[PDB]
């Protein structure tokens, strides 16, 4: 990526940068019971590792947000398991951090931006007489686990548990000898137990993060190492948000309460053979994993809103096959500033898959790229 | 049923700390040894160690120090427990009575904080003004040692350096000074601070030294005639003082890391160093009031040592966690090494019991355990009578084959890569002296490769008869002895995985079937699988194997082939696999317990129940058809039940029991007549060489024993005044919980030790639920009978004191 700034997409300049911004963190204590409102027209798997821009039309939700600004501005997004019966078991709590009011055409329109924080289990759904839904919520705690060897550590070998700082672990050479030394010295006390060292390394957070980074660097060649957060929990949520997978897999990832299990599941999902297809014909391949690149700090997939309020998960790829351009490039709304768009449909589906972005300036390096919507994608396994 | 009874059969043998001082009296040299929850006191005489006292503590001993304040005629003992219970102990003798008196006690736990990576460090300054504890990163805790601090109040001072490796107190300074080594992005440095009790902060120290070796790990405080400190690293030994920097790089210490030290003479001219391989060094300091040079010489080889202590004249105690503890003599004569060591006494250490089996059930079963690691590896035969068979390599798993009268043991030995590319052994081990040997396939710097072997050991003589060497990079994980299908032959079955350093998840593995006939090992069948075989069990004439996250059942065909029958896919890794009839219990390392059943009509596996709760799990055992037992994080035991009084409740494994044991359990076995109102018998083996027994109880017995435990807690005086309920409370981070469903047999068996008047007050007003059917006032003799009948479910004990 040359002559393009990755900070433009993530700031959501299309919604407007004049939003009044609210600061001051609220966080319910672990395992307690809370009552939180739920927006009715938002059926998506909210991951704490992603944001949520929203534009609302109907009066009930605008009044709900208006008086919710006072009430800790926290609402719940339900992970709907079936859209018809609209039942769910888990969810995520997001606070409004950006918000503004319009009066265009004589109708109040509210634009807000939210970020997921906590996971919860829902007990019962109260349908208000006002038409909004308020749910009974129990906070699922964050499970932090000590080192596996802290329960058998020799008192004399505690002295040798501080290692010299890790060198470069990128490109190819990386620090492979350093990780061999790390395995030998950290899991030395595995000789007191029945399991070998590599088994304990398969359940070690740092090694799993290294493996995920190394795997990502092969497909996304321009990824520099500072992009991913250095905390296991934040890393696991960021990777979970960024992975283009189905609703069942995302709900499965959200059900996991420990960072280690989440990292292991993410590695399994990544290693499983994958290719992206439109769901109406699983025969018809659109994009491979080699063509996926991250145009923003949020990775290859993020959340955006069209002028009508619908939310699309957009995956940015270099070459998307089986697509039919309809119309001419236009810039009436700009998720990616400086890029026009044109609608795309599969050759025989005739269903909307995404948009073609055509560069307007004559010198930007990623001149032609494709944005596909996640709701129309299916990761076929050969 | 749900209610269980846990009793200690063999008390822990591993040594995790030892000090020398004047504890019993001013004229007596004493050796104090700490084992897990065990404290032993010895008077050092010319003929050896004379045992005097044995006291059990309500916790795991993390810090032991001897100090003498002003006005005291003899030393005091400071103990800090892993649950942060601290006490100061005194020794009192009144005639034939020996009592340990508690002078001060309290809990030093902080409500917020993260435990340090390098563990709990406890140091007492030479002049006995305070005690310094490093429990959490970034905080240093000081306890004043004035005579009115009965409850041990403490204050926290802020260390600006977060990653601290070692802390020590210096000698000769007018104000209390500490020295420590810390790590930052700039490297590793040495810094000194001054501790002020009056204003409670850190003042600047006498000196600061940036240039410290990158692998410096240990700090040695030098007594008054020299002063300063010595920093021990992987390469260099340095003496640090104001305007005094002496450094040496002896080639003899490059091969191994030094992990322990002890001061030989009171003037600090001599020190003893010990390394991870079992070598013993002496550090010599040359003087003119000032230091001139440092010299290092090698004395010889001992057991792999955890702690060293110099006793009397020329006698050194070697305390080992991996092997037998030793008493050695420092002769000037060099039999084979300069100032060689002569062994004079050895002490048993069952060490890290990895696997065990029970054999010869008739006349009384016998327990065979795989104990020790590296050159300390040995087989232990326990009947308490213990027999040791040295192997000189690490024993992993053991199984018994009654038809051939032999034991199959998986082992591994470390070998170095020679320049020619071949592997070479450092010492002759059991695998290299076998009468007959075979290799799976004929195949061909300074890197250590691990070679895995299968050994056949005779029942009567325990001589090694056959050794089998596996392929390159091959890891042996599981071993069973069983009959399959309609075949009358008995086979050894071994599950292996191919591990290469360039991939973390093993892509390949194989299952091998061996037959032992005519004194020769023959390979009958060989099967290749795409994964690692973590566990294998015998399931009603079929072989149940866990390959990665796949559970597979294998048939035995007439053509001596393994054939797949049914396949079940999980989202977890099946490390633990136990069966009872038609039920299969599957558990990964993250405590995610899964219960499956084999339905023979359809030939498929079905999921009955599950329970997912992230925690590190060490072992599981099936108690009965409804109860399952496991080892939790920290040192805890848990029991879960199924079908407790919708399909939601049926698919939930409800927890029933927690209990804090203090031991890390590796293996569970079913042995009942091994010793000849309890049901079942399960024996477990711990890292500290502890063997324990679990038996199931009923309603009335569990209620009566719990009531008796509550009454006994009010009468038994604990050392350090630690509460038994707090000690047995289930303890991990994020929560602590009271113990439920477990009866501690040790407190019940202590009932036979107390005096008659105290027994009467324990029993008084207890309404005895006699089995005859009428409830009546309990007499002391009835409870004596019940407790004796309870002690008749486990072995006798040897005598400690002399
Ligand atoms: N900060 C940050 C950050 C976080 C995450 C990412 N990438 C990712 O998660 N997947 C990713 N990327 C590029 C190429 C291929 C990729 O998967 C291929 C795949 C496709 C379908 C199913 C499963 C895997 C990032 O590029 C940046
Ligand atoms: O980069 C992007 C992705 C594209 C996206 N859209 C979608 C869109 C539909 C429309 N209605 C229409 O054409 C339309 C056409 C015929 C009948 C009725 C309506 C107007 C503006 C936008 C618009 O801007 C956006 O918001 N920015
Ligand atoms: Zn299509």
Query: Is any ligand 1 atom within 6 A of the Cβ of residue A255?
Result: no
3-state DSSP call for residue B626? Answer: coil
**Boundary (domain end) residue, out of A96, A116, A139:** A139
Residues A30 and A130 placed together within one structural domain of the fold: yes
Strand partners for B187:
B184
Minimum CA distance residue for ligand 2 atom 7: A306
Q: Tell me if A363 is assigned to some domain.
A: yes
Residues A246 and A266 placed together within one structural domain of the fold: yes
Q: How far is B259 from chain A, CA to nearest CA, in Å?
A: 6
3-state DSSP call for residue B523? Answer: strand
Query: Is any ligand 2 atom within 6 A of the Cβ of residue A272?
Result: no
Tokens of A345: 């449909």
- Chain A contact probe: residue of B355, B473, B504, B532 with most A CBs at under 10 A: B504
| Elucidation method | cryo-EM
**Boundary (domain end) residue, out of A255, A272, A289:** A272
Cα→Cα distances B717→A253, B54, B159, B750, Å: 52, 15, 38, 11
Count of domains for chain A: 3
Q: In this structure, what CATH number is given to the domain that contains residue A132?
A: 2.30.130.40
Q: How far is B676 from chain A, CA to nearest CA, in Å?
A: 29
Q: Tell me if A59 is assigned to some domain.
A: yes
What percent helix, strand, coil does chain B show, rounded to 5? 10, 50, 40
Residues A304 and A262 placed together within one structural domain of the fold: no
Residue A216 Cα to ligand 1 middle (Å): 6
* Contact B384/A at CB under 8 A: no
Q: Inspect the interface and report whether the beta carbons of A156 and B306 lie closer than 8 Å.
A: yes
Which DSSP state fits B648? Answer: H
Ligand 2 atom at shortest distance from the alpha carbon of A330: 24
Q: Interhelix angle for B756-763 vs B780-791, to 10°? A: 100
Characterize A318-335 residue by residue with b for buried, 16 or more Cβ atoms within 10 angstroms of its Cβ, and e for exposed: eebebbeeeeeeeeeeeb
Rounded-to-integer distance, Cα B778 and Cα B764, Å:
7
Q: Tell me if A257 is assigned to some domain.
A: yes
Rounded-to-integer distance, Cα B720 and Cα B87, Å:
5
Question: To test the ligand 2 pocket, which listed residue (A313, A339, A341) has its Cβ within 8 A of the most ligand atoms?
Answer: A341
Structural domain boundaries, residue A43? 16-139
The verdict on whether residue A355 carries a ligand-binding annotation is no
Rounded-to-integer distance, Cα A373 and Cα A313, Å:
5
Q: What are phi and psi of B244, to 5 degrees?
A: -155, 110
Residues A76 and A51 placed together within one structural domain of the fold: yes
Q: Tell me if A3 is assigned to some domain.
A: no
Domains of chain B: 12-276 (2.130.10.10), 702-791 (1.10.150.910)
3-state DSSP call for residue B214? Answer: coil
Q: In this structure, what CATH number is given to the domain that contains residue A258?
A: 1.20.58.1480
Q: Inspect the interface and report whether the beta carbons of A194 and B667 lie closer than 8 Å.
A: yes
The verdict on whether residue A265 carries a ligand-binding annotation is no
Which DSSP state fits B779? Answer: P
User: For chain A, how big is the Rg over CA atoms in Å?
Assistant: 23
Q: Tell me if A169 is assigned to some domain.
A: no
Characterize B715-753 residue by residue with b for buried, 16 or more Cβ atoms within 10 angstroms of its Cβ, and e for exposed: eeebbbebebebbbbbbbeeeeeebbbbbbbebbbebee
Residues with Cβ within 8 Å of residue B473, at least 6 apart in sequence = B498, B499, B500
Residue A333 Cα to ligand 2 middle (Å): 8
Check: CB of residue A19 under 8 Å from CB of residue A98. yes
Minimum CA distance residue for ligand 2 atom 20: A307
Q: Which ligand is nearest to the CA of A289?
A: 1
Which DSSP state fits B752? Answer: G
The shortest CB-CB distance from A151 to any of B185, B499, B616 is to B616
Q: Inspect the interface and report whether the beta carbons of A260 and B354 lie closer than 8 Å.
A: no
Query: Is any ligand 2 atom within 6 A of the Cβ of residue A306?
Result: yes
The single residue listed with the structure tokens 């710097």 is B445
The single residue listed with the structure tokens 């042996």 is B476
Residues A247 and A218 placed together within one structural domain of the fold: yes
Rounded-to-integer distance, Cα B787 and Cα B791, Å:
6
Q: Inspect the interface and report whether the beta carbons of B614 and A155 lie closer than 8 Å.
A: no
Q: Inspect the interface and report whether the beta carbons of A180 and B218 lie closer than 8 Å.
A: no
Write the DSSP string, B106-133.
EE---SS--B-TT--EEEE-TT-SEEEE
3-state DSSP call for residue B354? Answer: coil
Q: Interhelix angle for A205-219 vs A259-271, to 10°? A: 30
Residues A219 and A311 placed together within one structural domain of the fold: no
Cα→Cα distances B352→A45, A367, B407, B606, Å: 47, 64, 20, 37
Residues A359 and A254 placed together within one structural domain of the fold: no
Question: A–B: how many Cβ contacts below 8 A?
Answer: 106
Ligand 2 atom at shortest distance from the alpha carbon of A306: 26
- The helix or strand, by DSSP H or E, that contains position B783, with its residue range, turns out to be helix B780-791
Rounded-to-integer distance, Cα A66 and Cα A56, Å:
12
Strand partners for A299:
A296
Q: In this structure, what CATH number is given to the domain that contains residue A318?
A: 2.170.150.20
The shortest CB-CB distance from A151 to any of B260, B475, B664 is to B664
Cα→Cα distances B213→B126, B187, B198, B218, B231, Å: 27, 9, 35, 11, 9
Rounded-to-integer distance, Cα A233 and Cα A257, Å:
10
Q: Tell me if A189 is assigned to some domain.
A: no
Q: How far is A119 from chain B, CA to nearest CA, in Å?
A: 16
**Alpha-carbon dihedral angle through residues B433, B436, B442, B446, given to the nearest 10 degrees:** -10
Mapping DSSP onto H, E and C, the string for chain A reads CCCCCCHHHHCCCCCCCCCEECCCCCCCCCCCEEEEEECCCCCCCCCCCCEEEEEECCHHHHHHHHHHCCCCCEEEEEEEEECCCCEEEEEEEEEEEEEEEECHHHCCEEEEEEEEEEEEEEEEEEECCCCCEEEEEEECCCECCCCHHHHCCCCCHHHHCCCCCCCCCCCCCCCHHHHHHHHHHHCHHHHHCCCCHHHHHCCCHHHHHHHHHHHHHHHCCCCCHHHCCCCHHHHHHHHHHHCCCCHHHHHHHHHCCEHHHHHHHHHHHHHCCCEEEECCCCCCEEECHHHECCCECCECEEEEECCCCCEEEEEEECCCCCCEEEEEEECCCCCCCCEEEEEEECCCCCCEEEEEEEECCCCCCCCEEEEEEHHHEEEECC
Residues A283 and A225 placed together within one structural domain of the fold: no
| Chain A, nearest residue to B119 by Cα | A158
Residues A249 and A314 placed together within one structural domain of the fold: no
Residues A29 and A133 placed together within one structural domain of the fold: yes
Q: How far is A198 from chain B, CA to nearest CA, in Å?
A: 7
Check: CB of residue B534 under 8 Å from CB of residue B549. no
Rounded-to-integer distance, Cα B124 and Cα B143, Å:
10
Query: Is any ligand 1 atom within 6 A of the Cβ of residue A49?
Result: no
Which DSSP state fits B751? Answer: G
Q: What are phi and psi of A345, to 5 degrees?
A: -135, 150
Characterize A29-51 residue by residue with b for buried, 16 or more Cβ atoms within 10 angstroms of its Cβ, and e for exposed: eeeeebebbbbbebebbbbbbbb
* Residues shown for chain B: 802
Write the DSSP string, B566-625.
EEEE-SS---EEEEETTEEEEE-TT--EEEEEEETTTTEEEEEEEE--------EEE-SS
> Do strands B38-45 and B30-35 pair parallel, antiparallel, or not at all (unpaired)?
antiparallel
Tell me whether residue B47 is exposed, middle or buried, using C-beta atoms within 10 angstroms of its C-beta: 0 to 12, 13 to 18, 19 or more: exposed
- The helix or strand, by DSSP H or E, that contains position B780, with its residue range, turns out to be helix B780-791
The verdict on whether residue A33 carries a ligand-binding annotation is no
CA dihedral sign of residues B107, B110, B111, B115: negative
Write the DSSP string, B416-455.
EEPTTS-EEESS--GGGS-SEEEESS------EEEEEEEE
Residues A236 and A345 placed together within one structural domain of the fold: no
* Contact B17/A at CB under 8 A: yes
Q: How far is B415 from chain A, CA to nearest CA, in Å?
A: 15
The single residue listed with the structure tokens 């390159």 is B472
Residues A129 and A207 placed together within one structural domain of the fold: no
Q: Tell me if A297 is assigned to some domain.
A: yes
Residues of chain B with Cβ-Cβ distance to A195 below 8 Å are 575, 589
Check: CB of residue B530 under 8 Å from CB of residue B508. yes
Q: Inspect the interface and report whether the beta carbons of B185 and A165 lie closer than 8 Å.
A: yes
Which residues of B, range 594-623, sit inside 8 Å of A by Cβ? 614-616, 618
Q: Tell me if A256 is assigned to some domain.
A: yes
């Amino acid at each position: 990526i040359i002559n393009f700034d990755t900070s433009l997409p993530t700031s959501h300049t299309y919604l407007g940068a004049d939003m009044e911004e609210f600061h001051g963190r609220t966080l319910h204590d672990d395992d307690s019971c809370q009552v939180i409102p739920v927006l009715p027209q938002v059926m998506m798997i909210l991951i704490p590792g992603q944001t949520l821009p929203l534009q609302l039309f109907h009066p009930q939700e605008v009044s709900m947000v208006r008086n919710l600004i006072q009430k800790d501005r926290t609402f719940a997004v339900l992970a709907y398991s079936n859209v018809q019966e609209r039942e769910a078991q888990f969810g995520t709590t997001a606070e409004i951090y950006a918000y503004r009011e319009e009066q265009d055409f004589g109708i109040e329109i509210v634009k807000v931006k939210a970020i997921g924080r906590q996971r919860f289990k829902v007990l019962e759904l109260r349908t208000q007489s006002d038409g909004i839904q308020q749910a009974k919520v129990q906070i699922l705690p964050e499970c932090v686990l000590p080192s596996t060897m802290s329960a058998v550590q020799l008192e004399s070998l505690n002295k040798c548990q501080i290692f010299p700082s890790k060198p470069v672990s990128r490109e190819d050479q990386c620090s492979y000898k350093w990780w061999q030394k790390y395995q030998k010295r950290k899991f030395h006390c595995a000789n007191l137990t029945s399991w070998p060292r590599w088994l304990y390394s398969l359940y070690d957070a740092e090694t799993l993060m290294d493996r995920i980074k190394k795997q990502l660097r092969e497909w996304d060649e321009n990824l520099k190492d500072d992009s991913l957060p250095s905390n296991p929990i934040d890393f696991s949520y960021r990777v979970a948000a960024c992975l283009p997978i189905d609703d069942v897999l995302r709900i499965q990832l959200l059900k996991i309460g420990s960072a280690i299990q989440r990292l292991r599941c993410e590695l399994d999902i990544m290693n499983k053979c994958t290719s992206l297809c439109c769901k109406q014909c699983q025969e018809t391949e659109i994009t491979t994993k080699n063509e996926i690149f991250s145009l923003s700090l949020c990775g290859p997939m993020a959340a955006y809103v069209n002028p009508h309020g619908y939310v699309h998960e957009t995956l940015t790829v270099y070459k998307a096959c089986n697509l039919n351009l309809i119309g001419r490039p236009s810039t009436e709304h700009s998720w990616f500033p400086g890029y026009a768009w044109t609608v795309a449909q599969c050759k025989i589906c005739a269903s909307h898959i995404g948009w073609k972005f055509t560069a307007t300036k004559k010198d930007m390096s990623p001149q032609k790229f494709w944005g596909l919507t996640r709701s129309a994608l299916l990761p076929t396994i050969p | 049923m749900s209610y269980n009874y846990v009793v200690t059969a063999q008390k822990p043998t591993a040594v995790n700390g030892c000090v020398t001082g004047h504890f019993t009296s001013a004229e007596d040299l004493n050796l104090l040894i700490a084992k897990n929850t065990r404290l032993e006191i010895y008077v050092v005489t010319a003929e050896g160690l004379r045992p005097v006292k044995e006291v059990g503590m309500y916790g795991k001993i993390a810090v032991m120090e001897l100090f003498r304040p002003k006005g005291e005629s003899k030393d005091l003992l400071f103990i800090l427990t892993a649950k942060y219970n601290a006490c100061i102990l005194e020794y009192k003798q009144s005639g034939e009575s020996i009592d340990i008196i508690t002078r001060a006690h309290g809990n030093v736990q902080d409500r917020i904080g993260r435990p340090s990576e390098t563990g709990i460090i406890g140091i007492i300054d030479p002049e006995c003004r305070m005690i310094g504890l490093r429990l959490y990163d970034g905080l240093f805790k000081v306890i004043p040692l004035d005579r009115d601090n009965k409850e041990l109040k403490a204050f926290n001072i802020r260390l600006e350096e977060l990653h601290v490796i070692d802390v020590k107190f210096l000698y000769g300074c007018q104000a209390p000074t500490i020295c420590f080594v810390y790590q930052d992005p700039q490297g590793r440095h040495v810094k000194t601070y001054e501790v002020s009790l009056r204003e409670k902060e850190f003042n600047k120290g006498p000196w600061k030294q940036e240039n410290v070796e990158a692998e410096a790990s240990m700090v040695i405080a030098v007594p008054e005639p020299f002063g300063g400190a010595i920093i021990i690293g992987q390469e260099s030994i340095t003496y640090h003082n104001g305007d005094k920097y002496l450094a040496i790089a002896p080639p003899i210490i490059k091969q191994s890391t030094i992990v322990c030290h002890n001061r030989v003479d009171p003037n600090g001219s001599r020190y003893l160093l010990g390394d991870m391989e079992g070598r013993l060094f002496m550090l010599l300091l040359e003087k003119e009031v000032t230091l001139k040079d440092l010299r290092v010489e090698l004395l010889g080889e001992t057991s792999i040592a955890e702690c060293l202590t110099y006793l009397d004249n020329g006698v050194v105690f070697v305390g080992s966690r991996l092997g037998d503890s030793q008493l050695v003599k420092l002769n000037v004569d060099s039999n084979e090494q300069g100032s060689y060591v002569v062994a004079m006494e050895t002490f048993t250490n069952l060490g890290p019991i990895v696997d065990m089996c029970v054999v010869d059930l008739e006349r009384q079963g016998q327990l065979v355990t795989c104990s020790g690691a590296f050159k300390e590896g040995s087989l232990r035969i326990i009947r308490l009578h213990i027999r040791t068979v040295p192997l000189y390599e690490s024993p992993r798993k053991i199984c018994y084959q009654e038809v051939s009268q032999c034991f199959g043991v998986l082992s591994s030995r470390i070998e170095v890569q020679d320049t020619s590319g071949g592997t070479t052994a450092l010492r002759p081990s059991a695998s290299t002296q076998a009468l007959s040997s075979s290799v799976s396939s004929s195949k061909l710097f300074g890197e250590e490769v691990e070679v895995h072997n299968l050994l056949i050991i005779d029942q009567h003589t325990f001589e090694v008869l056959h050794a089998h060497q596996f392929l390159q990079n091959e890891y042996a994980l599981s071993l069973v002895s069983c009959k399959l299908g309609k075949d009358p032959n008995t086979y050894f079955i071994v599950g292996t995985a191919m591990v290469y350093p360039e991939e973390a998840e093993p892509k390949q593995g194989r299952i091998v079937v061996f037959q032992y006939s005519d004194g020769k090992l023959q390979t009958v069948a060989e099967k290749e699988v795409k994964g690692a075989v973590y566990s294998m069990v015998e399931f009603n004439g079929k072989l149940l194997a866990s390959i990665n996250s796949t559970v597979r059942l294998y048939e035995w065909t007439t053509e001596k082939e393994l054939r797949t029958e049914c396949n079940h896919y999980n989202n977890i890794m099946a490390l633990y696999l136990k069966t009872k009839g038609d039920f299969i219990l599957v558990g990964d390392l993250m405590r995610s317990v899964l219960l499956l059943a084999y339905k023979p009509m359809e030939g498929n596996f079905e999921e009955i129940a599950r329970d997912f709760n992230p925690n590190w799990m060490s072992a599981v055992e099936i108690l009965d058809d409804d109860n399952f037992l496991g080892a939790e994080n920290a040192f805890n035991l848990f029991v879960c039940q199924k079908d407790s009084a919708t399909d939601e409740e049926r698919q939930h494994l409800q927890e029933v029991g927690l209990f804090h044991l203090g031991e890390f359990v590796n293996v569970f076995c079913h042995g009942s007549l091994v010793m000849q109102p309890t049901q079942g018998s399960v024996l477990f083996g711990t890292v500290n060489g502890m063997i324990g027994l679990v038996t199931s109880l009923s309603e009335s017995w569990y209620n009566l024993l719990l009531d008796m435990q509550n009454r006994l807690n009010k009468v038994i005086k604990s050392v350090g005044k630690i509460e038994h309920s707090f000690w047995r409370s289930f303890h991990t981070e994020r929560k602590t919980e009271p113990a439920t469903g477990f009866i501690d047999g040790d407190l019940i068996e202590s009932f036979l030790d107390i005096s008659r008047p105290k027994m009467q007050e324990v029993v008084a007003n207890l309404q005895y639920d006699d089995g005859s059917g009428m409830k009546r006032e309990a007499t002391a003799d009835d409870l004596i009978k019940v407790v004796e009948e309870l002690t008749r479910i486990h072995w006798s004990h040897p005598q400690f004191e002399k």
